C-alpha positions in Angstrom: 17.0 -40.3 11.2 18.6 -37.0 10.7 17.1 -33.8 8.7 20.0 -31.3 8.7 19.0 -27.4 7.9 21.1 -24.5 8.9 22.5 -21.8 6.2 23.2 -17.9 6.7 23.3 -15.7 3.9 23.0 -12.4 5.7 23.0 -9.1 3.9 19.9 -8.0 1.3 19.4 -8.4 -1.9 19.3 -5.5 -4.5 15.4 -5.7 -5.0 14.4 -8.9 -6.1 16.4 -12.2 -6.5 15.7 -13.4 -10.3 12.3 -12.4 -12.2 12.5 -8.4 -12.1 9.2 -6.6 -11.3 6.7 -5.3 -13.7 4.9 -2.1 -13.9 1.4 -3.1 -13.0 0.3 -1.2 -9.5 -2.8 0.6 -8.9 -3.5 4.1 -8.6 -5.0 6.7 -5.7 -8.7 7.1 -8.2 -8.7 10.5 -7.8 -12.6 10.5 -7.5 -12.6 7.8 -4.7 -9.9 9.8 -2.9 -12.0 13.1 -3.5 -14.8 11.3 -2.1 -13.0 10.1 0.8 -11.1 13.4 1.2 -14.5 14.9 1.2 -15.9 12.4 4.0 -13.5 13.7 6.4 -10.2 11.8 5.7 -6.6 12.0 4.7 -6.0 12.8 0.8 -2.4 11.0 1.8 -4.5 8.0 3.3 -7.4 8.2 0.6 -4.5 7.3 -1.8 -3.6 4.3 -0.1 -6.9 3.0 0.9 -7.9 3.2 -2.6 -4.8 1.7 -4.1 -4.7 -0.9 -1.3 -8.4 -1.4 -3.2 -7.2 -0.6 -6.6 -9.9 1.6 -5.8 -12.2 -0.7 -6.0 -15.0 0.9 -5.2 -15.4 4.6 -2.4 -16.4 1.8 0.1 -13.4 -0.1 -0.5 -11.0 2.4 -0.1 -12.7 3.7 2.9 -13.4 0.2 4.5 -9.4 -0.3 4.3 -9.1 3.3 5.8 -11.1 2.2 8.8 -8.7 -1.2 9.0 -5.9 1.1 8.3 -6.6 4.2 10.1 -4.1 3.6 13.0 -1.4 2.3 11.3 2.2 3.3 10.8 2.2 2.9 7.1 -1.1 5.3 6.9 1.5 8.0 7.4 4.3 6.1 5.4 4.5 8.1 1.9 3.2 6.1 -1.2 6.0 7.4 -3.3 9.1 7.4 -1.6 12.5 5.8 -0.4 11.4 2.4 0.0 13.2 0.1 1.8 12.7 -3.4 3.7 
């Protein structure tokens, strides 16, 4: 029996490889993120938490904060030069 797998294609693609994306992302709710920025948190992080939650729900965002306090992407900018 044989099986036979080995290919390199090195280099990145420019985005996505067929099927483009579509706009269709969350947002930072800006009452969540007041809420949370009010509790004692990170505007910047209260974004994401609540995005990460399509802000969901205050809770939510906040829950994700706490699994996402001490993170390197809690600093990472929402908005920026991605790249990956």
């Amino acid at each position: 029996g044989s099986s036979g797998s080995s290919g390199g294609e090195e280099l990145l693609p420019d985005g996505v490889p067929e099927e483009v994306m579509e706009s269709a992302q969350p947002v930072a709710n800006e009452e969540i993120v007041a809420q949370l920025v009010s509790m004692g948190f990170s505007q910047l992080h209260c974004q994401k938490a609540a995005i990460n939650t399509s802000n969901a729900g205050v809770e939510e965002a906040m829950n994700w904060l706490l699994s996402h306090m001490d993170d390197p992407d809690i600093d990472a900018p929402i908005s920026g030069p991605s790249s990956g």
